[PDB]
């Protein structure tokens, strides 16, 4: 029952949060980050509204918590081509940058974790990003597999513990 | 007789395209009925198991 | 595909012999051709329809305050709320602020404000940016009540910077000028008029004008830091609004009324008052209402029966089955409007709707505009609508239509003494809907008869039918305009680079191909 | 979604209640025919995805530097004049050392003798850097095996003789009049086109050894010989080029633009449709298509006839469609057997209107294991049968004479060395017969019913053939390619620029 030290953290949450201190500033200031649905995702934001809960395919909710920069990613840093990046689920992309940052905040050079017994335990679900660019349907398969949300971190950083 | 016991349920499963057309009113059932998490949790619910699913 | 197109060609032409090869079709074909005909008609009206919207954007890690910043603050507020936090934010962002307190009379005057600016920045260096908080005073201009202090101060500050010859970019800040969501309160028209002015100032003087930025009701160090972050940041966005939620940017988006169901029916009953009813758009409104079975029409104008064509317009309207009354009345005079709403409206035909299309044109470049020229325009545009709204409170109206313009929606050069009044009408409608009244502000494009650098003139038949559909759907702020995005998006982007048309796919396609 | 989209969903789902709701009783009879029309349009879009065509792209060429010694292999008939003299000087001009090895027809078609003559020509000196072969410039047939061209037997014996020696030099195979770049350029030679079919397979089996193919114009020239060495020694990644007076051209596969307009030249069948290999796999599918289209008499031919595996089963199906069937056990390779077949079996009331050549021997193997005897068996029926049928049917105005080629010829696949040359020869025969004012079509077929290449459903394949016949489609390529995995696997074996104009293949590699 040994206590487990938290030595690094990383996050991107609604209201401009991209770090643990940004999250602290949000709750310390008592800020409400709920805002309008994103307008750059092909959603029929105008047509989907209806106050009647029984209306099919509609929603009575007009605002929620979003990462309005969910598609922003340094593909080149992780050796991912622009076309693989487009067909890659943003959940995998967000996990790659957050994982890199969390190791850095722990005072750990993420590249010195190559070949270590470092495990990756991720909670995630399939959210239908692929509802595809030419020459990237193969990339779209692993790029949208829920198992690869954890596995790609171990692959990219050469971690040898379970993902 | 396993109701109320510390019985865990560990399932390896992936979501498939069973439901993308469901009966009227059965929309609530379509949600839990196609959640990969419920593939394990349903066993614990139906048999009253108290360990993690 | 061309096979699918050839199928529809035979359906629309109603050719049975061609369709069977490509009978039971005989009874089906005219019902299918009628549905396809109705969809083309609906598609024609929908192409004209847009709406202003606020795009939530990611909060950027803004750059430092590069250089000395002149923060022009009004005296009325003094160092208390917003002025204290914005100066502290510029200071902590690596910049040297120089606060300048200004009188209400000094803020309105061009030459007096310019002298005060040269006096404050005299010893120090030439600034790289100017941040004006003068729009935060909600009071009216002394002597000229229809001119707000916010619009007059913002006009005097921009034209004073041209006289002084300073290169510093001007960022004008407001609070409650725009409403980004339902929860957000209705917009203050005295501050919304500054946004109407700012879009025109942006096009006439692209380097001088940096942009507009709206602030939440309360002041705080958190939003002040966000403010200087967007002013000193990379930019691109010249119309932003800061709220608790984060950052919002003004956008234009298509608003097709096809999937939106037709709530309520446009049944013109009783008396429908139409200001400017003897000529221009009001004359086309009168024709539209008389065709829809209007009982009584009270067409108003400051000329009345002596207006050109009023003699045969009344004949045309009574021939369409509609009782008509034409009266000479200055809508800017509250007493005249009160007498009109008691003598001219009959008992058997009570007032059910008002269509405000009254205005006086006095166009000129920002450099030539003065508060005196603004008062004449705002007296009838805003003042008339305020008088007609306040005097018809007890009456139960079905609709109150304010005629706005594309000059407010996005702006054009020369419309600096035209767009502010239209923007104040849009904000007035929001205030009236918050009180539970059926106000509607219509962002109209140019009409046939009465600039084609992409903006095509609207055909009155399409324009009135698009207005009718919007009324039949409780649309708050419909934008009705015929735009050739292939030419307009490039022409507007050349005058001033903006991302306002980013969510119109035809406009974004034109910008990428360049 | 939109109102037009909702309309088509109710048509496909065959939901009458939702259909009248999507628009403003007689719909019951309309809905099945309309949904059937919508189904044929989806299959037409799938058919459009199968169409490709081999084209020749002009390319710019500037004094390339040649290195090492260049072994120029040549037939003994042409040595001393023509192309062999000007090519030997062009390599000497560029820096290289020519070694013009003159070889006769007997030593040229045998790998042991050819390899021994190469070993003796090179001698104790340094190994060559390039091997330029002019052996394909022999138009004669092999002695005793008339269906094997000297050009093909020599090219096969050369690549395998070089493998036996293990010289590591890059083999550039030169040819003349094997390809047509501009249509009116001139019809191709089947003996030399077979060399390209062989060459594409050799390119994938031995990528380092095989450098490529270069077609030459008819008359020899100093400027053309200079441009020949310019592309061999030059830094050009083009393995299939053709030189003409106009300039340099490169072979490219490209999607054929979709029809999208009525094909008002309906496939009108009648009389007698001769079909070789009718009892076989592809032959049976063609017979089904013709009998369904409304043929009068289908003269199926094969080595077995009625005593085949499923001949009685096929005849009992075909009779119900509305056509008389007369199958025969005659070998298409023997000329005397075809002469008597076009009189004893074909009746006078229904004369020969069309010919569909689909006969082939089931032989396939790697380049190393091939021999001239093994190649005679395949080319006896594939090429030999086609020329015998064409020459005898000259006294009759045919509607169509389709030849069944293959994807192995169009782009090549390893292990098709005794298969692709015959298919490439058919392509050359078709353009030679079209020049004579006769109707001919060489269809580069895919697999019917290998990775990347999906099997074509026979119904969709015969529909593509029918639409190609309705159009005056010269050499259509009909195949279902999974460009994503195919273009990567093809590049892994041999990096090529041939699939550059196909957007799907170009994207796959990036």
Residues linked to residue C401 through DSSP beta bridges, in sequence order: C355, C440
Does the distance separating the beta carbons of D507 and A135 come in below 8 Å? Answer: yes
- Alpha carbon distance, N-terminus to C-terminus of chain D: 34
Chain C residues whose beta carbon lies within 8 Å of the beta carbon of residue D25: 27
Asked if the C-beta of A74 comes within 8 angstroms of chain C's C-beta atoms, the answer is no
C512 vs C490: CA distance, rounded Å: 10
Q: What is the dihedral of CA C14, C20, C26, C32, to 10 degrees?
A: -50
Q: How many residues does chain C have?
A: 514
The burial of D144, by beta-carbon neighbours within 10 Å (0-12 exposed, 13-18 middle, 19 or more buried), is given as exposed
Residue D452 has, within 13 A of its CA and on its CB side, a CA count of 15
The full 3-state SS of chain A, as one line of letters, equals: CCCCCCCCCCCCECCCECCHHHHHHHHHCCCCCCEECCCCCCCCCCCCECCCCCCCCCECCCEECCCCCCCCCCCHHHCCCHHHHHHCCHHHHHHHHHHHHHHHHCCCCHHHHCCCCCCCCCCCCCCCCCCCCCCCHHHHHHHCCCCHHHHHHHHHHCCCCCC
Q: Return d(Cα A138, Cα D482) in angstroms, integer.
A: 12
C248 alpha carbon, distance to own chain's centre:
18
Q: Which helix (H) or strand (E) holds D171?
A: strand D170-176
> What span, in angstroms and rounded, lies between the C-alpha atoms of A153 and A163?
8
Residue of A nearest to D506 (CA): A135
Q: How many CB atoms lie within 10 A of CB C335?
A: 9
* Residue where the block lists tokens 């904000």: C427
For the stretch D43-62, what's the b/e string if a residue is b when 16 or more beta carbons lie within 10 angstroms of its beta carbon?
A: ebeebbebbbbbebeeeeee
With beta carbons less than 8 A apart as the criterion, state whether C371 and C144 touch: yes
D27 touches chain C (CB under 8 A): yes
Tokens of C334: 């509250």
D449 touches chain C (CB under 8 A): no
CB of A22 less than 8 A from some CB of C: no
The rounded distance, in Å, linking the Cα atoms of D47 and A126 is 34
Contacts of A146 in chain B (CB under 8 A): 14-15
| CB atoms A63 and C181 under 8 Å | yes
For Cα atoms A69, A73, A78, give the angle at the middle one, nearest 5 degrees: 165
Residues 6+ apart with CB under 8 A from C322: C289, C290, C293, C294, C295, C296, C297
Given an 8 Å threshold on Cβ–Cβ distance, is C259 in contact with A32? no
**Which chain D residue has its CA at the smallest distance from A137's CA?**
D484
Contact A134 D503 (CB under 8 A): yes
Q: Which tokens in the block code for residue D160?
A: 């395998």
The neighbouring-strand residues paired with C400 are C354, C439
Query: In the beta sheet, which residues pair with residue D75?
Result: D103
Rounded-to-integer distance, Cα D250 and Cα D237, Å: 11
Identify all chain C residues contacting A42, using CB atoms and an 8 Å cutoff: none
HSE, CB side, 13 Å, CA atoms: give it for residue C306.
4
Residue in C439, C475, C480 with CA at minimum distance from that of residue C460 = C480
Instruction: Give chain A positions within 8 Å (CB) of D485.
Output: 138
A146 vs B14: CA distance, rounded Å:
8
Check: CB of residue C362 under 8 Å from CB of residue C417. Answer: yes
User: Which residues in chain C have their CB less than 8 angstroms from residue A46's CB?
Assistant: 253, 255, 260
Spans of all domains in chain C: 1-514
Binding-face residues of C in 148-207 toward A, CB within 8 A: 180-183
Round to whole Å and give the CA distance between D220 and D226: 11
What's the number of CA atoms in the CB half-sphere (13 Å) around residue A67?
14
* Of the candidates C272, C284, C299, C263, the residue with the CA atom closest to the CA atom of residue C399: C272
Render C116-171 in DSSP notation, one character per residue: HHHHHSSSSPPPSEEEE-GGG--PBPSS-TTSBHHHHHHHHHHHHHHHHT--PEEE
The set of chains that have 3 or more CB pairs under 8 A with A is B, C, D
Q: Are strands D400-406 and C351-356 parallel, antiparallel or unpaired?
A: unpaired
Specify the DSSP class assigned to residue C379. I
- Counting every residue written for chain A, the total comes to 163
**Whole-angstrom distance, CA of residue D23 vs CA of residue D30:** 15
Of the candidates A129, A131, A130, A12, the residue with the CA atom closest to the CA atom of residue A65: A12
A35 and C243 within 8 Å at the Cβ level: the answer is yes
Nearest-CA distance A22 → chain B (Å): 31
Q: Which residue of C has its CA nearest to D259?
A: C2
Query: Quick count: other Cβ atoms within 10 Å of Cβ C127?
Result: 22
Number of Cβ within a 10 Å radius of residue A135: 23
Chain D nearest-CA distance from A87, in A, is 14
Structure tokens of C356? 């405000």
D192, containing H or E segment: helix D190-205
H or E element that contains D8: helix D3-13
A-D C-beta contacts closer than 8 Å: 19
HSE-CB at C485 with a 13 A cutoff on CA atoms is: 20
| Resolution limit, Å | 2.3
Shortest CA distance to C431 belongs to which of C263, C264, C213, C191? C191
Q: Which two tokens stand for residue C270?
A: 């009783």
- Smallest CA–CA distance, residue A31 to chain B, in Å, is 32
Neighbours of D127 (CB within 10 A): 13
User: Which helix (H) or strand (E) element contains residue C401?
Assistant: strand C399-405
Helix (H) or strand (E) holding D154: helix D150-165
Task: Give 3-state DSSP helix, strand, coil % of chain C, rounded to 5.
Answer: 45, 20, 35
3-class SS of residue D465? helix
* 8 A C-beta contact, residue C455 and residue C406: yes
Residue A30: left if φ>0, alpha if ψ -120 to 50, beta else—which one?
left
Cβ-based neighbour number of residue C399 at 10 Å:
18
Parallel/antiparallel/unpaired status of strands D297-302 and D324-325? parallel
Q: How far is CA C302 from the centre of its chain?
A: 24
Tell me D475's DSSP state.
S
Q: Distance between CA C437 and CA C11 in Å, rounded?
A: 46
Burial class for C394, CB neighbours closer than 10 Å (0-12, 13-18, 19+):
exposed
For the stretch A16-22, contacts whose Cβ atoms lie closer than 8 Å and that sit 24 or more positions apart, written own/partner, are: A16/C58, A16/C59, A16/C246, A18/C61, A19/A101, A20/A105
3-state secondary structure of C1: coil
Contacts of residue B37, defined as CB under 8 A and 6 or more positions apart, other chains included, come to A125
Q: Which residues contact D39 (CB under 8 A, 6 or more apart)?
A: none
Other C-beta atoms lying within 10 Å of the C-beta of residue D481 = 23
Q: What tokens does D36 get?
A: 């059937």
* Cα–Cα distance measured from residue C351 to residue C271, given in angstroms and rounded to the nearest whole number: 5
Q: Are the Cβ atoms of A81 and D507 closer than 8 angstroms?
A: no
For residue A44, the chain D residue with the least C-alpha distance is D1
Nearest to A137 among D484, D503, D510 (CB): D484
Residue C114, both tokens: 């310019």
From chain A, the residues in CB contact with D483 under 8 A are 135
Chains that touch D (3 or more CB pairs under 8 A): A, C
- Per DSSP, helices labelled H in C266-379 are 281-291, 310-319, 334-343, 371-378
Residues of A in contact with C248 (CB under 8 A): 35-36
Taking a C-beta distance cutoff of 8 angstroms, is the pair C404, C422 a contact? yes
3-class DSSP string for D193-252: HHHHHHHHHHHHHCCCCEEEEEEECCCCCHHHHHHHHHHHHCCCCCCEEEECCCCEEEEE
- Cα C353 to Cα C471, D155, D178, D182, D358, distances in angstroms: 12, 93, 85, 75, 82
Q: List strand residue ranges (DSSP E) for C425-478, in order.
A: 439-444, 455-456
Cβ atoms within 10 Å, residue B43: 14
Cα A94 to its chain centre, rounded Å, is: 3
Residue D433, phi then psi, degrees to nearest 5? -75, -35
| 3-state SS, one letter per residue, for D240-306 | EEEECCCCEEEEEEEECCCCCCCCCCCCCCCCEEEEECCCCHHHHHHHHHHHHHCCCEEEEEECCHH
Q: Which of C493, C494, C465, C445 is nearest to C50 (CA)?
A: C445
Measure in Å the smallest separation between the Cα of D507 and chain A Cα atoms: 5
Judge residue C58's burial from the number of C-beta atoms within 10 Å of its C-beta, 0-12 exposed, 13-18 middle, 19 or more buried: middle
Q: Residue holding tokens 């205005």?
A: C359
* Largest Cα span, chain A: 55
Q: Which two tokens stand for residue A123?
A: 């909670």
Instruction: Residue C388: name the closest of C319, C463, C332 by CA.
Output: C332
Pairs of CB atoms within 8 A across A/C: 57
Instruction: Give strand pairing partners of D297.
Output: D272, D324
- Non-local (6+) Cβ contacts of A27 within 8 A are none
DSSP assignment letter at D166 = T
**What is the DSSP-derived secondary structure letter of residue C365?**
-
Residue D122 · residue D71 · CB < 8 Å? yes
Question: Which residues of C fall within a CB distance of 8 Å from A47?
Answer: 259-260
Asked if residues D300 and D279 have their Cβ atoms less than 8 Å apart, the reply is: yes
* HEC secondary structure over C8-54: HHHHHHCCHHHHHHCCCHHHHHHHHHHHHHHHHHHHHHHCCEEEEEE
Q: What is the 3-state secondary structure (H, E, C) of D350-419?
A: CCEEEEEECCCCCCCECCCCCCHHHHHHHHHHHCHHHHHHHHHCCCCCCCEEEEEEEHHHHCCCCCECCC
C31's torsion region: left (phi>0), alpha (psi -120 to 50) or beta?
alpha
3-state DSSP assignment of residue C363:
coil
The total of other beta-carbon atoms located within 10 Å of residue D302's CB is 24
Answer yes or no: are the C-beta atoms of D174 and D131 closer than 8 Å: no
| Nearest neighbour of D510 by CB, restricted to A135, A137, A138 | A135
Q: What are phi and psi of D408, to 5 degrees?
A: -60, -30
Buried b (16+ CB within 10 A) or exposed e, C224-242: bbbbbbbbbeeeebbbbbb
Read off φ and ψ for residue C172, nearest 5 degrees.
Answer: -95, 125
Beta-bridge partner residues of D55: D252
H-run or E-run covering B46: helix B38-47
Element (H, E) at D59: strand D51-59
Q: Could A137 and D508 be called an inter-chain contact, meaning their C-beta atoms sit closer than 8 Å?
A: no
Is D6 buried (19+), middle (13-18) or exposed (0-12) by CB count in 10 A? Answer: middle
Contact (Cβ atoms closer than 8 angstroms) between residue C266 and residue C472? yes
- Which of D1, D451, D484 is the best mutation test for A, with the most CBs of A within 10 A? D484
Q: How far, in Å, CA of C270 to CA of D280, rounded?
A: 86
Output helix, strand, coil percentages for chain B, rounded to the nearest 5.
30, 0, 70
Nearest CA in chain B to A123: B37
Count of Cβ atoms closer than 10 Å to residue C436 Cβ: 6
- Distances in Å between the Cα of C225 and the Cα atoms of C92, C361, C458, D155, D505 are 9, 41, 45, 78, 51
Residue D323 token pair? 């056509």
C-alpha angle C75-C78-C83 in degrees, rounded to nearest 5: 115
Residue C181 contacts residue A61 (beta carbons within 8 Å): no
Q: Which two tokens stand for residue C480?
A: 């009705």
- CB count in 10 Å sphere of residue B17: 6
How crowded is residue D91: how many other Cβ atoms within 10 Å of its Cβ?
25
Of C4, C28, C39, the CB nearest to D3: C39
CA distance B21 to C285: 48
Rounded to whole angstroms, the Cα distance separating B35 from A125 reads 9
């Amino acid at each position: 029952r040994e206590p487990i030290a938290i030595i690094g953290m990383a996050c991107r949450l609604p209201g401009g949060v991209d770090s643990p201190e940004g999250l602290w500033e949000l709750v310390d200031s008592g800020t409400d980050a709920i805002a309008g649905f994103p307008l750059d995702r092909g959603w029929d934001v105008e047509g989907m509204y209806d106050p009647d809960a029984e209306a099919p395919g509609k929603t009575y909710v007009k605002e929620a918590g979003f990462l309005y920069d969910a598609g922003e990613f340094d593909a080149g840093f992780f050796g991912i081509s622009p076309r693989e990046a487009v067909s890659m689920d943003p959940q995998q992309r967000l996990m790659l940058e957050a994982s890199w940052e969390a190791f850095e905040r722990a005072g750990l050079d993420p590249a010195r974790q190559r070949g270590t017994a470092t495990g990756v335990f991720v909670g995630a679900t399939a959210t239908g990003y692929v509802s595809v660019p030419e020459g990237a349907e193969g990339f779209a398969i692993t790029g949208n597999m829920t198992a690869v949300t954890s596995g790609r971190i171990s692959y990219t950083l050469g971690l040898q513990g379970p993902a | 007789r396993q109701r109320g016991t510390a019985t865990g349920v560990f399932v390896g499963a992936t979501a498939t395209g069973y439901v993308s057309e469901v009966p009227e009113g059965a929309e609530g059932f379509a949600i839990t009925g196609n959640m990969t998490a419920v593939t394990s949790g349903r066993i614990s619910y139906t048999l009253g198991l108290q360990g993690p699913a | 595909t061309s096979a699918e197109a050839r199928f529809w060609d035979a359906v629309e032409d109603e050719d049975l012999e061609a369709l069977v090869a490509a009978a039971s079709w005989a009874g089906v074909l005219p019902a299918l051709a009628g549905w396809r005909r109705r969809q083309r008609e609906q598609s024609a009206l929908d192409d004209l329809r847009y709406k202003v919207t606020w795009k939530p954007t990611a909060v950027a890690d803004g750059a430092s305050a590069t250089g000395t910043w002149l923060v022009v603050v009004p005296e009325s507020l003094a160092g208390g709320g917003w002025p204290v936090v914005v100066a502290r934010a510029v200071d902590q962002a690596g910049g040297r602020p120089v606060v300048l307190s200004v009188d209400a009379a000094d803020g309105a005057d061009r030459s007096r404000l310019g002298l005060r600016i040269h006096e404050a920045l005299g010893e120090g260096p030439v600034p790289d940016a100017v941040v004006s908080l003068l729009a935060l005073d909600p009071s009216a201009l002394p002597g000229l009540p229809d001119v707000p202090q916010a619009l007059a101060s913002t006009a005097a500050l921009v034209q004073a910077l041209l006289d002084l010859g300073l290169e510093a970019r001007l960022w004008c800040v407001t609070s409650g000028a725009v409403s980004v969501s339902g929860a957000d309160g209705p917009s203050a028209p005295e501050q919304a008029a500054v946004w109407g002015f700012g879009r025109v100032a942006g096009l006439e003087h692209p380097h001088l004008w940096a942009g507009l930025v709206d602030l939440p009701p309360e002041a705080d160090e958190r939003t002040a830091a966000r403010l200087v972050g967007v002013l000193a940041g990379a930019g691109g966005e010249d119309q932003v609004a800061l709220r608790s939620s984060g950052v919002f940017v003004r956008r234009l988006v298509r608003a097709p009324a096809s999937e939106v169901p037709a709530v309520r029916s446009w049944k013109p009953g009783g008396t429908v008052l139409v200001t400017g009813g003897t000529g221009g758009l009001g004359r086309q409104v009168a024709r539209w209402l008389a065709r829809g079975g209007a009982d009584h029409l009270l067409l108003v104008s400051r000329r009345g029966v002596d207006a050109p064509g009023a003699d045969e317009l009344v004949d045309e309207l009574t021939d369409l089955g509609a009782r008509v009354t034409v009266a000479a009345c200055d809508v800017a005079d509250r007493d005249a409007v009160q007498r009109l709403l008691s003598e001219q409206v009959p008992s058997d035909a009570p007032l059910t709707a008002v269509i405000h299309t009254a205005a006086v044109l006095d166009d000129g470049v920002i450099d030539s505009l003065s508060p005196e020229r603004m008062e004449q325009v705002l007296r009838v545009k805003v003042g008339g609508a305020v008088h007609l709204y306040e005097l018809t409170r007890e009456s139960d109206l079905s609709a109150f239509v304010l005629f706005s313009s594309f000059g407010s929606t996005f702006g054009l050069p020369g419309l600096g003494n035209y767009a502010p009044g239209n923007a104040a009408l849009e904000a007035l409608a929001e205030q009236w809907r918050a009180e539970g009244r059926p106000a509607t502000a219509v962002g109209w494009g140019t009409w046939a008869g009465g600039r084609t650098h992409g903006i095509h003139e609207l055909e009155p038949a399409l324009a009135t039918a698009a207005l009718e559909q919007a009324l039949e759907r409780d649309e708050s702020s419909p934008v009705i305009i015929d735009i050739d995005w292939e030419r307009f998006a490039v022409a507007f982007h050349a005058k001033r680079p903006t991302r306002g048309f980013e969510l119109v796919p035809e406009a974004q396609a034109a910008l990428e191909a360049a």
